[PDB]
């Protein structure tokens, strides 16, 4: 047939006929305006199509042009600094070509420009007759000041090289490589295409074992995360990772985001900068965005995740470390519930499709550290941070999969304590993997992490009993434990996100602060315990009277600015306070 | 170009059920098309195609299906989707929920015809809103501040004074001084006293030449509610993005809109969401709420203030629940404050404005505004916890510090929240009423505030 | 004259209400006032006194006409009204008159056909609008509106419709809201320029 006809329409769902050769998840083009849709059910010579665009004004007997391919994404030069639709339409090019604030229905623009010329350099070790395989790097494009864009043979492509282009400037339409296998030939340009629903293959997945630093002390200290991690969070961190992290490339997916909040990200990110080789550069040179505001079509909302993870697997394969942020996995699960309802399926719990946990697990299990395909030996990774927006089925399904979970506390948020993460329901399962990194690079931190979690849990039981008895019965060691728990909550776990001194707290600052607070806890508790069974007995009030300057210095340790002061000064200042503490306790 | 070809008229009606008429033998049916129905007595109704299949079309009828029959009633198919006429002459006019006049003036002589669904504005072309609207209400301007171009609902309930808060915002709104709004007002399912109150207030203020009203009262047909927000917002988009006005849009009960969707969805026998609402309720509401804000290279704007009656005061009900996942905040009207004759009854704890963080502060309003808002919030949160403890243990268990928080909680509700309906407070009066409460405490308790802000503003 | 019960009788203009409907209760008249043209609900569990408040308001209020509707409630609660109201008298011009001279009743007791409870409500409000148009101040009592909502649930159930909350049809809120909008104070149609009103006092049986 090559084109069917529309038989019926009801919202974003189209039924078409003479679709006899059609396959599950083929894309089609519907109507005289050629709207994209994806096939999702077959019955004889009829197909049901989920349309990615508004169907208003579509008529019975309209054409359905039957394309041969599944939903798939253009991969190659020109992804850095791009803004994309959930379906990979280029929002900055559509704006420029149409000269208008609107998006036209059925608009067609290639996701990567064929007009721009890219500087290409081949791998120089390759010559005609060389044997090559999927994932082999065969050239480099100088896309940007930060990013050397490796050009790779597509996965499932292979053979013997018949032509390889000289160093020069080329269009994304120009043939840079040709090869042969079983007498069949392929001609290849700098751009490949991949189905977003298919995992990009690798030689080997590897254990994740290096921290993914975030600017926030709660997350770095109590609930660590790793390069190649899977994390769920409440929906601060988005800017923080982007301007300050161990990651090479950032991908942000605004899946179901509010109009004026997506507009914040799209204005804000291109203004931000980082310092590279003693020179300052925009972070937009190593970032790509997928934008999908809450009013865009429900099927594009669903695809927006698969686009962003495929773009992340593409830079993983080059041997980069990639960080992906998904702005709500709950607003994505909202789309699955709607599409499942439009298809007359039986739900499971709370109206969600019974396959929701398979859909989530298939997304999150695309994270990891890997040994890439093809000939140059590499490692790369994708780290996924998924916002959750509530007990509920989406949270319950997510906790079966993710290795780290950070939960919100409404008591902290309503007391205007930030970041408002609950340190008693949160968890991280990476700590045994990371303890060899902490053993190699810090040695002291594992005891400090352990003791801080004990103090925070011990005080949570005392905080129940003092509601009954009004504090009066409490022993001095236990008052010491209340008051130091508060020091930790207000002067370590609390962190202002906007002030320059605490915009990003490096790990040498993080270990330094906590080392002093735990050293204080030991000496203050030892003074009380050593003067039990005695005529002179030390109390928290005696320590507070004797050591008010040490409490003022301890509470002030947060103010050290890592932009103004170096490692040596910040360590020396904290070490001088440790001596001031010891001298004060020796003076008691 | 035009639709110059004739319109087919069908007597082939085949079923009638609730708000729906079903036709067959329809030639090449078009989804979302408009249909005009002439009844056996010559009454004219209007409707829209909700589904097509082969020769069969399902029409929702806006004015209801009473008196329709399967033989004499005839449908004319217009060949097109719903386009409303628009013009700048719509300011100072009154229309029903279908957009027909009720002021005894003529019908709109168009400057254009616009599709009531609007057209998608590119996320690259939007501008992030940073001008603060001074609403004149301290519980908003001090702790839940509104940017010009925001979407921010009022969440309320039966018997509470949300209409007075809405009218007071319309009287008192302007920019902070170191323009004045065109108003588009929509009503779904309001009683006659509510419609009279708002119309009377805009006349009492002497400003009706700058406002457009679309009214669907509780005796008018419920399926007109499906289009009423979309007529209002299509008018606001012409006025804002073609005539360069600053528009404020008021949508006065989203709960009675959401019930009209549930009728149509129930009549179609669609698969339910929670509480029987449509499975697509989020995606539908989002088409109304995301029609707001600012665009690059055009001087106008739209600010949106929806209003919700929450059933049983349940904020987790699907109507207020889904509205929070789309709009940039909420203002919450509280029965416990209303029962004590506080006005506004705004509870500052569940209230939020997500765009305030960048609209306030140095150069915008005053350099303390961020710190004072955080500290006033933390004091009220602690004071409400002390109040809840005190009722178990009696005042003999409370410390002198617990009495400082319990004193603050009274002085805050008596002076900062309580205001009265025609009092208008600047941001500056709002902040300096705020500092008179923060002085209840010694400096050492004000933990949210940095020493520079304490040093500059506490001694006064 | 003959009128369709489902269609609102026209008026020149609805007016703000400006005068109390005195019930003769100390509570109600002091703490929670009502007006000529007002809308009231009386929710409460069995035995709370909804019908006794309805009967007391019917006997002693400052209204020119009473229309009393008993859809889906007891036959003895109708029989009590028929027994009492001929004996009880108001005073006119120094002469006493039975209050049954100002009263009409619409009965459809809890064992009469379920579908007729809808017709009772629309009959009683149409009768109330007819005397409003003469320039009278009328009160309508509807001694349980839950019995009407519960009748809609069976008819809707046998029509095999999809339910909203707790089995009720999705149109229930529109059926209630358009009934209560028939209350008010008005300038009547026509030219002798009179004014009249209907107050509605709907009991609810949760």
């Amino acid at each position: 047939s090559t084109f069917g006809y529309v038989h019926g329409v009801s919202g974003p769902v189209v039924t078409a006929c003479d679709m006899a050769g059609a396959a599950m998840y083929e894309l089609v083009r519907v109507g005289h305006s050629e709207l994209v849709g994806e096939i999702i059910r077959l019955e004889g010579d009829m197909a049901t199509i989920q349309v990615y665009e508004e169907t208003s004004g579509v008529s019975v007997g309209d054409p359905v042009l039957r394309t041969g391919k599944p939903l798939s994404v253009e991969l190659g030069p020109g992804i850095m600094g791009a803004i994309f639709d959930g379906i990979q339409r280029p929002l900055s090019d559509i704006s420029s070509q149409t000269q208008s604030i609107y998006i036209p229905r059925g608009v067609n623009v290639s996701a990567l420009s064929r007009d721009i010329k890219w500087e290409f350099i081949p791998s120089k070790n390759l010559r005609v007759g060389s044997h090559i395989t999927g994932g082999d790097i065969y050239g480099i494009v100088n896309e940007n000041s930060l990013i050397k864009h490796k050009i790779m043979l597509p996965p499932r492509s292979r053979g013997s090289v018949t032509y390889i282009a000289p160093p020069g400037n080329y269009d994304a339409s120009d043939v840079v490589l040709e090869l042969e296998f079983e007498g069949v030939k392929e001609k290849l340009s700098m751009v490949q295409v991949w189905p977003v629903r298919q995992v990009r293959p690798v030689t080997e997945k590897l254990p994740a074992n290096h921290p993914l630093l975030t600017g926030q002390r709660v997350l770095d200290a109590l609930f660590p995360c790793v390069q190649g991690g899977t994390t769920a969070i409440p929906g601060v961190i988005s800017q923080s990772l982007s301007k300050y992290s161990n990651s090479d490339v950032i991908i942000y997916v605004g899946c179901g985001e509010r109009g004026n909040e997506m507009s914040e990200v799209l204005r804000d990110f291109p203004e931000l900068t980082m310092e590279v080789d003693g020179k300052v550069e925009s972070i937009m040179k190593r970032t790509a965005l997928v934008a999908n505001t809450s009013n865009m079509p429900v099927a594009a909302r669903e695809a927006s995740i698969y686009t962003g993870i495929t773009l992340s697997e593409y830079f993983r394969d080059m041997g980069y470390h990639v960080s992906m942020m998904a702005d709500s996995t709950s607003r994505w699960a909202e789309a699955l519930r709607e599409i499942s309802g439009r298809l007359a399926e039986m739900p499971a719990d709370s109206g969600y499709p019974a396959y929701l946990g398979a859909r989530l697990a298939s997304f999150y299990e695309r994270a990891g550290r890997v040994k890439c395909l093809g000939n140059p030996e590499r490692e790369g990774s994708v780290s996924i941070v998924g916002a959750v927006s509530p007990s509920d089925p989406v949270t319950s399904a997510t906790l079966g999969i993710v290795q780290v979970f950070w939960g919100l506390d409404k008591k902290l948020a309503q007391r205007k304590h930030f970041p408002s993460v609950n340190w008693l329901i949160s968890y991280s399962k990476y700590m045994r993997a990371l303890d060899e990194y902490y053993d190699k690079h810090f040695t002291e931190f594992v005891p400090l992490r352990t003791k801080a979690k004990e103090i925070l849990q011990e005080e949570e039981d005392l905080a129940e009993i003092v509601q009954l008895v009004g504090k009066a019965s409490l022993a001095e060691t236990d008052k010491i434990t209340l008051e130091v728990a508060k020091l930790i909550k207000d002067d370590f776990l609390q962190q202002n996100g906007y002030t320059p001194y605490d915009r990003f707290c490096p790990f040498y600052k993080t270990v330094g602060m906590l080392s002093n607070m735990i050293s204080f806890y030991d000496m203050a508790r030892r003074a009380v315990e050593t003067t039990a069974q005695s005529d002179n007995k030390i109390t928290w009030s005696i320590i507070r009277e004797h050591m008010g300057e040490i409490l003022y210095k301890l509470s002030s340790m947060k103010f050290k600015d890592p932009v103004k002061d170096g490692e040596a000064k910040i360590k020396a200042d904290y070490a001088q306070l440790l001596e001031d503490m010891q001298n004060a306790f020796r003076s008691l | 170009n035009y639709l110059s070809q004739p319109r087919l008229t069908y007597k082939t009606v085949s079923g009638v059920n609730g708000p729906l008429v079903i036709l067959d033998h329809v030639k090449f049916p078009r989804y979302a098309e408009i249909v005009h129905l002439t009844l056996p007595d010559g009454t004219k109704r209007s409707g829209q195609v909700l589904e097509v299949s082969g020769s069969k079309a399902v029409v929702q009828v806006f004015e209801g299906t009473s008196g329709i029959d399967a033989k004499k009633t005839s449908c004319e198919f217009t060949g097109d989707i719903l386009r409303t006429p628009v013009s700048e002459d719509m300011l100072g006019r009154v229309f029903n929920g279908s957009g027909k006049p009720i002021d005894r003036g003529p019908v709109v002589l168009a400057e254009d015809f616009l599709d009531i669904m609007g057209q998608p504005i590119n996320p690259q072309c939007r501008i992030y809103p940073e001008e603060m609207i001074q609403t004149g209400i301290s519980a908003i301007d001090g702790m839940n501040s509104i940017a010009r171009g925001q979407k921010i609902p009022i969440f309320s309930a039966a018997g509470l004074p949300h209409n007075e808060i809405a009218a007071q915002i319309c009287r008192q709104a302007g920019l902070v001084k170191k323009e004045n709004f065109a108003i588009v007002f929509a009503a779904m399912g309001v009683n006659m006293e509510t419609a009279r109150f708002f119309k009377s207030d805009f006349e009492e203020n002497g400003s009706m030449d700058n406002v457009c009203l679309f009214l669907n009262l509780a005796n008018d047909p419920t399926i007109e509610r499906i289009i009423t927000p979309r007529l209002a917002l299509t008018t606001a988009e012409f006025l804002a993005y073609q005539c360069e006005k600053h528009v404020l849009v008021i949508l006065t009960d989203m709960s009675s809109y959401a019930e009209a969707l549930r009728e149509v969805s129930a009549a179609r026998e669609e698969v339910p969401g929670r509480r029987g609402f449509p499975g697509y309720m989020y995606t539908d509401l989002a088409t109304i709420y995301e029609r707001a804000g600012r665009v690059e290279g055009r001087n106008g704007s739209i600010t949106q203030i929806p209003i919700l009656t929450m059933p049983n005061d349940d904020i987790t009900h699907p109507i207020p629940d889904l509205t929070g996942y789309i709009t940039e905040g909420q203002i919450y009207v509280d029965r416990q404050l209303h029962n004590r004759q506080i006005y506004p009854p705004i509870n500052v704890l569940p209230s939020l404005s997500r765009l305030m963080k960048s609209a306030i502060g140095e150069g915008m309003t005053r350099k303390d505004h961020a710190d004072v808002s955080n500290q006033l919030y933390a004091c009220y949160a602690i004071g409400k916890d002390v109040q809840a403890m005190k009722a178990v243990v009696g005042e003999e268990a409370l410390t002198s510090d617990d009495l400082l928080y319990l004193e603050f909680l009274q002085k805050f509700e008596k002076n900062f929240i309580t205001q009265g309906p025609y009092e208008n407070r600047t941001v500056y009066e709002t902040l300096d009423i705020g500092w008179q409460l923060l002085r209840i405490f010694p400096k050492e308790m004000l933990k949210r505030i940095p020493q520079s802000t304490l040093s500059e503003f506490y001694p006064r | 004259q003959v009128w369709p019960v489902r269609q609102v009788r026209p008026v020149t203009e609805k007016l703000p209400a400006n005068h109390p409907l005195l019930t003769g209760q100390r509570v109600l008249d002091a703490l929670f006032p009502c007006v000529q043209g007002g809308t009231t609900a009386i929710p409460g569990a069995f035995g709370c006194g909804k019908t006794v408040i309805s009967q007391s308001l019917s006997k002693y209020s400052n209204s020119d006409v009473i229309i009393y509707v008993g859809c889906g409630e007891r036959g003895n609660e109708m029989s009590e009204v028929l027994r009492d109201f001929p004996e009880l008298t108001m005073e006119v011009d120094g002469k006493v008159e039975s209050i049954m001279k100002r009263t009409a009743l619409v009965a459809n007791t809890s064992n009469m056909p379920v579908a007729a409870r809808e017709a009772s409500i629309y009959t009683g409000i149409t009768l109330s609008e007819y005397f409003r148009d003469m320039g009278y101040h009328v009160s309508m009592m509807a001694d349980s509106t839950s019995r009407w909502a519960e009748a809609l649930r069976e008819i809707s159930g046998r029509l095999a419709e999809m339910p909203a909350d707790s089995g009720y049809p999705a149109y229930l809120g529109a059926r209630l809201a358009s009934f209560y909008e028939r209350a008010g104070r008005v300038k009547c149609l026509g030219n002798p320029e009179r004014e009249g009103s209907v107050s509605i006092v709907g009991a609810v049986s949760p």
């Binding site: 007359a344 739900p347 | 026998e269 698969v271 339910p272 | 095999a160 999809m162 339910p163 089995g167």
Partner: peptide, 25 residues
């Protein structure tokens, strides 16, 4: 539960009327 039944019944009736139309083809 009462709404997940009834939706099954309406689907069953549609499948029966569909099959009983194929008996006319």
């Amino acid at each position: 539960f009462y709404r997940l039944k009834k939706i099954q019944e309406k689907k069953k009736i549609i499948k029966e009327k569909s099959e009983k139309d194929l008996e006319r083809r």
